[PDB]
Amino acid sequence: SRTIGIIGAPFSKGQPRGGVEEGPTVLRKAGLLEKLKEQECDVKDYGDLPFADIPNDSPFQIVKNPRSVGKASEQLAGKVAEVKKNGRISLVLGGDHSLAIGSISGHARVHPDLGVIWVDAHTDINTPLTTTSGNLHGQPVSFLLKELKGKIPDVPGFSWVTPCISAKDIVYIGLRDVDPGEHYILKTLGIKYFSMTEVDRLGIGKVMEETLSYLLGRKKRPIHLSFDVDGLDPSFTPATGTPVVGGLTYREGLYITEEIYKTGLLSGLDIMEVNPSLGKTPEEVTRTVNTAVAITLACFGLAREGNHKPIDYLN
Amino acid sequence: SRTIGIIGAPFSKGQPRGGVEEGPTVLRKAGLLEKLKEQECDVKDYGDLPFADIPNDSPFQIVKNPRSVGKASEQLAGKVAEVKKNGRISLVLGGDHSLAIGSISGHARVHPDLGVIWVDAHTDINTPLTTTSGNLHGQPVSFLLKELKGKIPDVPGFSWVTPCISAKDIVYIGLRDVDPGEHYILKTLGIKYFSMTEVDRLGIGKVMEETLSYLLGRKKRPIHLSFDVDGLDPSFTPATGTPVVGGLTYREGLYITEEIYKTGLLSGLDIMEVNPSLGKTPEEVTRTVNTAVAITLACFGLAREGNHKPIDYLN
Amino acid sequence: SRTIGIIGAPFSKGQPRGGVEEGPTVLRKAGLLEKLKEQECDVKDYGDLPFADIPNDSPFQIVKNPRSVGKASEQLAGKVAEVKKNGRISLVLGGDHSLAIGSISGHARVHPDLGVIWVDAHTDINTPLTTTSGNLHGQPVSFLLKELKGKIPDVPGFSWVTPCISAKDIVYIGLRDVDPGEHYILKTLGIKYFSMTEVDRLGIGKVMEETLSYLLGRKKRPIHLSFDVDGLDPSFTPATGTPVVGGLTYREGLYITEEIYKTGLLSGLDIMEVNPSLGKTPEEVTRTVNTAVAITLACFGLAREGNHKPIDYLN
Ligand SMILES: Nc1ncc(C[C@H](N)C(=O)O)[nH]1
Ligand SMILES: Nc1ncc(C[C@H](N)C(=O)O)[nH]1
Ligand SMILES: Nc1ncc(C[C@H](N)C(=O)O)[nH]1
Ligand SMILES: [Mn+2]
Ligand SMILES: [Mn+2]
Ligand SMILES: [Mn+2]
Ligand SMILES: [Mn+2]
Ligand SMILES: [Mn+2]
Ligand SMILES: [Mn+2]
């Protein structure tokens, strides 16, 4: 069975648009905790991290809000490690995707052998020197990869980071808006990815088979799922900062998470980039939040074929 | 070739929302009969069954309108058997899905070796004792399965039922909202199903290959297709009582029916749960009705690749 | 590498609805040329052909505007051959699909061994005698096929045509609205096609594998892609004269074009049937135009997984 530890991370400064800091609020409001308890789930809420304002945080080169982002990730790393040591699956409600530096870092402190599945339209693997936007939500993976040590300058706020994963310990699914330096890094480091072209070619069934065999083939190990709702098509998750057409369908997102649940190895989860302020209508917001909740419930066992308890229902 | 016998079943008391009794009307209004005649089809309209009101019909335990539902199904069974003895494919226009008790029962009187394909978001397999809603459209399959004799109390209106199918003679496609007791029954009886997870994994092509091989592998036999429009995604069939997101696409529904047509074994068909009152706009209604008509025409040979008569068109 | 020669073909008389003659304009306005230059592309604009009015053009039998259509195609054939002799990939911006007579004809003058991929809801293979509509955009393929010589009357405006392709040198993808005489021609001539039924069965991955192996299996040869935006679902390309539900998705259209790009054999391209006047709203127009531009950029190398130049980005 499996214990869950919820962490709200109401944090937006990895990117410019306000509102993503409300994700933990609208996800809770949608009844996530109660719906989780409805399943097999032993659920503990660790609350919303209080990220204090860092008023003096001028860019580093063109990298924006570095001290704010670095410290939020440092704090979240602390908290995720606590949840993990408490023997629970960490569930980070974001918040922008820069928080993955802290979520994966903190997870890896307790489980260094982890493997990551990163579901996103974007690779989020720019370095401080290849970014053109300066937004740290487009860089988290570069901070985490050991191969890119040497390439990450000393950015204020991140002196606490130690790269904890190798290029062979991450798989991307969903990619369709990748910068040229990012694509170079993928090919140079030999990272495993299923862009939307591969999902089209192979079908999500084969994509998950290969994703899981790639990560678990040699031996089982904890899985970290970092799910950016912008990996799904904007027809399902429109309330997000950077929607990109041609995404994963609602079905594909449930398929990915149902298969990860079935491994019994989910160890940490990020549900990121929900930005209620950016829905064009109230219904775009509920659509987005509802989809995120459904993705989350699938991670913890909710199955489209149905579920039952180990009793005899014919009484 | 193939003769068709249309039966309207303007009946709603298997569930609470009025309007599904108008399905036969809007389907006819959309020109179904004429469009069928445009194909190879020898089409006879048996009219709309006149279901008299049963004013005294208080629940049985929590099961609602049992006498009404039982009698409508009894009457429809009578009529479907007549059509079948007339050597025609029965085409039941519903009406809520509780009518499948009568449609499959009546069909089986003439062809006891039939196999059923049930296309639906729901399994509709609660018994009177596992239902929580009391709505009989969520129970028809339990009345039909021989294995569940012993488990179906004597519900008023259904004393005429005799279970006519075994668990191994039905396949579900489309499932994504299954109650716990229903899931227990599926696993306990070893029923064959393709939930949306399986359709995602395998693709609708392989789903139909396996569906047909499972039902026809040992020997050919008549097929009964019970098609609930809520099996399709609400973006195609919104005017229905219980829409569930993440459904079969329009393409997938045509694929299912094109492959069943190609077997030459379609023997009876139900087109159920169209509820024009529930479209949010006139266009949701026409969208739903149009999709239902297209599904129906595919059952009788309309092919997306095209069709021609056995003449030389280059004259 | 690959040089491109853009040709605008603002022409509508292959069908009744005005507005498709504006396709080259809205595609250019959307920044196509600049976006192409952003890729590897050496881009030369050959301008918009000036199609003079032919005021005296009464139907031939029921075939409408034959002299206008024939002459526009004659002029376009001239220009495409020029671009091809200039060692560039011809990119025809339409305009209605009747222009394919000229585009493929002109291409074949320079590369007679070409193979055609025709992406469309329709086969566009009626002859002047099997058409029921009289619209020449529903006939271009019949004019091009050698096997149908004998079956094409002498239509005024087309005396310059010489059939340049065999039935075995075309593959259709996307088909879902095929007339009976057209279906007869497909089966009689043994043309290779993937209707939407086949795309559903096999998946677009296998469809392209088979399409390319069928055309290139025996030996590499130039590819002509004739892309009718109505091959995509109207939820992506609504501003078109004859939308048909159940089409190829945005993903599938990018998949088709990404795979053709990867062959290195794209030799000519048609982007047809964009009709901005027919969008129900301004957003339907931009949606359609945007999709067409994305399809076009994929033909010339834009990849969803990303792209980089052959430099070291980690500097
Ligand atoms: N949401 C998002 N993630 C990444 C981007 C764009 C770009 N690679 C960047 O790094 O800013 N956008
Ligand atoms: N349309 C529909 N069919 C079944 C349901 C829900 C539930 N299983 C029930 O049995 O009522 N809803
Ligand atoms: N756009 C379009 N192409 C073909 C058609 C319909 C019909 N086959 C015809 O030939 O007119 N419509
Ligand atoms: Mn991200
Ligand atoms: Mn993203
Ligand atoms: Mn049903
Ligand atoms: Mn249903
Ligand atoms: Mn066309
Ligand atoms: Mn077309």
And the tokens for C111?
Answer: 């590369």
- Quick one: which H or E segment has residue B152? none
Q: What is the dihedral of CA B210, B212, B213, B219, to 10 degrees?
A: 170
Q: Look up tokens 């990163």; give the residue.
A: A118
Q: What is the DSSP string of C80-128?
A: HHHHHHTT-EEEEE-S-GGGHHHHHHHHHHH-TT-EEEEESSS-----T
CA triple B285-B270-B6, angle to 5 deg? 90
Q: Which of A22, A107, A137, A198 is catalytic?
A: A137
Q: What is the DSSP string of B83-136?
A: HHHTT-EEEEE-S-GGGHHHHHHHHHHH-TT-EEEEESSS-----TTT-SS--G
- Under a CB-based contact definition with an 8 Å cutoff, are residues B115 and B169 in contact? yes
And the tokens for C28?
Answer: 């250019």
For this structure, is A107 an active site residue?
A: no
Cis preceding-peptide flag for C306 (omega within 30 of 0): no
- Under a CB-based contact definition with an 8 Å cutoff, are residues B276 and B23 in contact? yes
CB atoms within 10 A of CB C136: 33
* Residues constituting chain A: 315
Q: Which residues fall within 8 angstroms of residue A163, CB to CB, at 6 or more apart?
A: A143, A144, A145, A146, A147, A148, A149
DSSP state of A65: S
Q: How was this structure determined?
A: X-ray
- Under a CB-based contact definition with an 8 Å cutoff, are residues A169 and A116 in contact? yes
Phi/psi at B103 (nearest 5 deg)?
Answer: -65, -45
Q: What is the dihedral of CA A308, A309, A312, A314, to 10 degrees?
A: -40
Q: C293, C301, C295: which is closest to C29 by C-alpha?
A: C293
Cβ–ligand 1 contact at A103 (below 6 Å):
no
Q: C130, C128, C36, C139: which is closest to C91 by C-alpha?
A: C36
Q: C127, C164, C124: which is closest to C144 by C-alpha?
A: C164
Q: Look up tokens 């570069």; give the residue.
A: A142
Task: Considering only the C-alpha atoms of chain C, give the largest distance between any 2 of them, rounded to a whole number of Å.
Answer: 68
Find the ligand nearest to A227 CA: 4
Q: Look up tokens 């000229």; give the residue.
A: C102
Q: B78, B55, B79, B81: which is closest to B67 by C-alpha?
A: B55
Atom nearest to B242 CA in ligand 2:
1
Q: Which residues fall within 8 angstroms of residue A220, CB to CB, at 6 or more apart?
A: A263, A265
Mark yes or no for CB contact A130/C314 under 8 Å. yes
And the tokens for B106?
Answer: 């009546």
And the tokens for C98?
Answer: 């009747």
Q: Where are the beta strands (DSSP E) in chain A?
A: 3-8, 42-48, 89-93, 115-119, 170-175, 192-195, 223-228, 266-272
For this structure, is B147 an active site residue?
A: no
Sheet holding C223-228, edge to edge: C42-48, C3-8, C89-93, C266-272, C223-228, C115-119, C170-175, C192-195
- Under a CB-based contact definition with an 8 Å cutoff, are residues C22 and C283 in contact? no
Q: C5, C35, C75: which is closest to C289 by C-alpha?
A: C35
CB atoms within 10 A of CB B11: 27
- Under a CB-based contact definition with an 8 Å cutoff, are residues B243 and B236 in contact? no
Rg (CA), chain B: 18
And the tokens for A265?
Answer: 């190895």
d(CA A76, CA A82) in angstroms, rounded, equals 10
Q: Look up tokens 């980690």; give the residue.
A: C314
- Residues of C recognised as catalytic: 97, 120, 122, 124, 137, 228, 230, 273
Going by alpha carbons, the residue nearest to atom 6 of ligand 2 is B138
Q: Which residues of C touch A193 (CB under 8 A)?
A: 305
And the tokens for B60?
Answer: 């049985």
CA triple A234-A237-A241, angle to 5 deg? 80
Residue type, C254: L
Spacing, Cα C301 to ligand 3 middle (Å): 31
d(CA B295, CA B297) in angstroms, rounded, equals 6
Q: Integer distance in angstroms from the first to the last C-alpha of chain A?
A: 24
Shortest Cα–Cα distance, A217 to chain C (Å): 24
List all residues whose CB is within 6 A of at least one atom of ligand 2.
Answer: B 122, 124, 126, 131, 133, 135, 137-138, 179, 241-242
- Under a CB-based contact definition with an 8 Å cutoff, are residues C204 and C252 in contact? yes
Q: Which residues fall within 8 angstroms of residue B144, CB to CB, at 6 or more apart?
A: B100, B101, B104, B105, B161, B163, B164, B165
- Under a CB-based contact definition with an 8 Å cutoff, are residues B20 and B96 in contact? yes
- Quick one: which H or E segment has residue C267? strand C266-272
d(CA B157, CA A55) in angstroms, rounded, equals 74
And the tokens for C87?
Answer: 């060692």
Which of B15, B63, B126 most suits a substitution to test ligand 2, by most atoms within 8 Å of the C-beta?
B126
For this structure, is B228 an active site residue?
A: yes
Residue type, C194: F
- Under a CB-based contact definition with an 8 Å cutoff, are residues B254 and B295 in contact? yes
The helix/strand/coil state of B280 is: coil
CB atoms within 10 A of CB C265: 17
Among the partner-chain residues C255, C303, C307, the one whose CB lies closest to the CB of A200 is C255
Residue type, B152: I
Strand partners for C272: C228
d(CA C262, CA C172) in angstroms, rounded, equals 19
Q: A234, A289, A227, A236: which is closest to A256 by C-alpha?
A: A227
For this structure, is A111 an active site residue?
A: no
User: Which residues in chain A are immediately followed by a break of C to N over 2.5 Å?
Assistant: none
Mark yes or no for CB contact B203/A204 under 8 Å. no
Half-sphere exposure of A180 (CA within 13 A, CB side): 12
Mark yes or no for CB contact B197/A312 under 8 Å. no
CA triple A91-A96-A97, angle to 5 deg? 75
Sheet holding B3-8, edge to edge: B42-48, B3-8, B89-93, B266-272, B223-228, B115-119, B170-175, B192-195
And the tokens for C121?
Answer: 């809801």
Q: Integer distance in angstroms from the first to the last C-alpha of chain B?
A: 24
Q: C76, C79, C80, C58: which is closest to C67 by C-alpha?
A: C58
Which of C118, C119, C122, C129 most suits a substitution to test ligand 3, by most atoms within 8 Å of the C-beta?
C122
CA A117 vs. chain centroid, Å, equals 8
The helix/strand/coil state of B171 is: strand
Rg (CA), chain A: 18
Q: C193, C157, C189: which is closest to C173 by C-alpha?
A: C193
d(CA C277, CA C87) in angstroms, rounded, equals 35
d(CA C139, CA C144) in angstroms, rounded, equals 9
| Strand A223-228 to B89-93 pairing | unpaired
Q: Look up tokens 């509102």; give the residue.
A: A19
CB atoms within 10 A of CB C219: 7
Q: Which residues fall within 8 angstroms of residue C242, CB to CB, at 6 or more apart?
A: C15, C121, C122, C177, C230, C273
- Under a CB-based contact definition with an 8 Å cutoff, are residues B14 and B65 in contact? yes
Phi-psi category of B149—alpha, beta or left, where left has phi over 0 and alpha has psi -120 to 50? beta
Cβ–ligand 1 contact at A120 (below 6 Å):
no
Strand partners for B165: B145
Q: Which residues fall within 8 angstroms of residue A224, CB to CB, at 6 or more apart?
A: A103, A104, A107, A114, A115, A116, A117, A267, A268, A269, A270
d(CA B233, CA B226) in angstroms, rounded, equals 17
- Under a CB-based contact definition with an 8 Å cutoff, are residues B81 and B106 in contact? yes
d(CA B76, CA B49) in angstroms, rounded, equals 7
Rg (CA), chain C: 18
Cis preceding-peptide flag for A95 (omega within 30 of 0): yes
d(CA C271, CA C277) in angstroms, rounded, equals 17
Phi-psi category of A203—alpha, beta or left, where left has phi over 0 and alpha has psi -120 to 50? left
Q: Which residues of C touch B254 (CB under 8 A)?
A: 196-197, 200, 246
Q: C187, C205, C226, C212: which is closest to C95 by C-alpha?
A: C226
Among the partner-chain residues A175, A180, A185, the one whose CB lies closest to the CB of C304 is A175
Q: Which residues fall within 8 angstroms of residue C120, CB to CB, at 6 or more apart?
A: C97, C172, C173, C174, C175, C226, C227, C228, C230, C231
d(CA B254, CA C196) in angstroms, rounded, equals 10
Among the partner-chain residues B203, B204, B313, the one whose CB lies closest to the CB of C180 is B313
For this structure, is B312 an active site residue?
A: no
Shortest Cα–Cα distance, C146 to chain B (Å): 15
Going by alpha carbons, the residue nearest to atom 9 of ligand 3 is C138
And the tokens for C142?
Answer: 């019949």
d(CA B223, CA B246) in angstroms, rounded, equals 26
Share of chain B residues as helix, strand and coil, in percent rounded to the nearest 5: 40, 15, 40
DSSP state of A219: S
Task: Work out whether the CA dihedral B154, B155, B156, B161 comes out positive or negative.
Answer: negative
Q: Look up tokens 């991140």; give the residue.
A: A158
User: Which residues in chain C are immediately followed by a break of C to N over 2.5 Å?
Assistant: none
Q: Which residues fall within 8 angstroms of residue C249, CB to CB, at 6 or more apart?
A: C232, C233, C236
Among the partner-chain residues C175, C188, C245, the one whose CB lies closest to the CB of B305 is C175
Mark yes or no for CB contact C197/B304 under 8 Å. yes
The helix/strand/coil state of A305 is: coil
Q: A307, A289, A299, A302: which is closest to A91 by C-alpha?
A: A299
CB atoms within 10 A of CB A52: 9
**How far is residue B313 from each of residues A75, A112, B137, C181, measured CA to CA in Å?**
75, 70, 48, 5
Phi/psi at A169 (nearest 5 deg)?
Answer: -100, 15
Spacing, Cα C272 to ligand 9 middle (Å): 9
And the tokens for C103?
Answer: 């585009």
Residue type, B312: D
Phi/psi at A172 (nearest 5 deg)?
Answer: -95, 145
d(CA B178, CA B192) in angstroms, rounded, equals 14
d(CA C113, CA C39) in angstroms, rounded, equals 28
Find the ligand nearest to B97 CA: 6
- Quick one: which H or E segment has residue B66? helix B66-85
CA B293 vs. chain centroid, Å, equals 14
d(CA A264, CA A223) in angstroms, rounded, equals 9
DSSP state of B42: E
Q: A2, A4, A12: which is closest to A272 by C-alpha?
A: A12
Q: Which residues fall within 8 angstroms of residue C53, CB to CB, at 6 or more apart?
A: none
Phi-psi category of A299—alpha, beta or left, where left has phi over 0 and alpha has psi -120 to 50? alpha
Q: Where are the beta strands (DSSP E) in C31-86?
A: 42-48
Among C171, C197, C198, C210, the residue to mutate for chain B (most B Cβ within 10 A):
C197
Mark yes or no for CB contact C181/B314 under 8 Å. yes
List all residues whose CB is within 6 A of at least one atom of ligand 3.
Answer: C 122, 124, 126, 131, 133, 135, 137-138, 179, 241-242
- Under a CB-based contact definition with an 8 Å cutoff, are residues B204 and B255 in contact? yes
Q: Which residues of B touch A293 (CB under 8 A)?
A: none
Q: B251, A300, A15: which is closest to C235 by C-alpha?
A: B251
- Under a CB-based contact definition with an 8 Å cutoff, are residues A67 and A157 in contact? yes
d(CA C172, CA C76) in angstroms, rounded, equals 22
Q: Look up tokens 């990849």; give the residue.
A: C303
Q: Which residues of B touch C151 (CB under 8 A)?
A: 314
- Under a CB-based contact definition with an 8 Å cutoff, are residues A132 and A240 in contact? no
CA B308 vs. chain centroid, Å, equals 29
The fold of B1-315 is: Arginase; Chain A (3.40.800)
Spacing, Cα A34 to ligand 9 middle (Å): 50
| Strand B266-272 to B89-93 pairing | parallel
Q: Look up tokens 């039902």; give the residue.
A: B215
Strand partners for C162: none
Among A308, A311, A315, the residue to mutate for chain B (most B Cβ within 10 A):
A308
**How far is residue A314 from each of residues A48, B149, B154, C62, measured CA to CA in Å?**
43, 12, 16, 69
Question: Per CB distance under 8 Å, which residues of A are interface residues toward C?
Answer: 123, 127, 129-130, 151, 175-176, 178-188, 193, 195-203, 245-246
And the tokens for A198?
Answer: 């591969």
**How far is residue C25 from each of residues B132, C21, C33, C94, measured CA to CA in Å?**
60, 8, 12, 10
Q: Which of B198, B230, B259, B270 is catalytic?
A: B230
Which of B12, B20, B122 most suits a substitution to test ligand 2, by most atoms within 8 Å of the C-beta?
B122
| Strand C115-119 to C170-175 pairing | parallel
Q: Look up tokens 């709702």; give the residue.
A: A229
Q: Where are the beta strands (DSSP E) in chain B?
A: 3-8, 42-48, 89-93, 115-119, 170-175, 192-195, 223-228, 266-272
DSSP state of A233: -
Among the partner-chain residues B250, B304, B307, the one whose CB lies closest to the CB of C180 is B307
For this structure, is B273 an active site residue?
A: yes
Which of A179, A182, A185, A244 most suits a substitution to test ligand 1, by most atoms within 8 Å of the C-beta?
A179
For this structure, is B284 an active site residue?
A: no
| Strand C3-8 to C42-48 pairing | parallel
- Under a CB-based contact definition with an 8 Å cutoff, are residues C260 and C118 in contact? no
Q: Which long-range contacts (CB under 8 A, 24 or more apart) does A145-154 make?
A: A145/A170, A145/A189, A147/A189, A148/A185, A148/A189, A151/A127, A151/C314, A152/A127, A152/A128, A153/A60, A153/A61, A153/A128, A153/A129
Residue type, B246: G
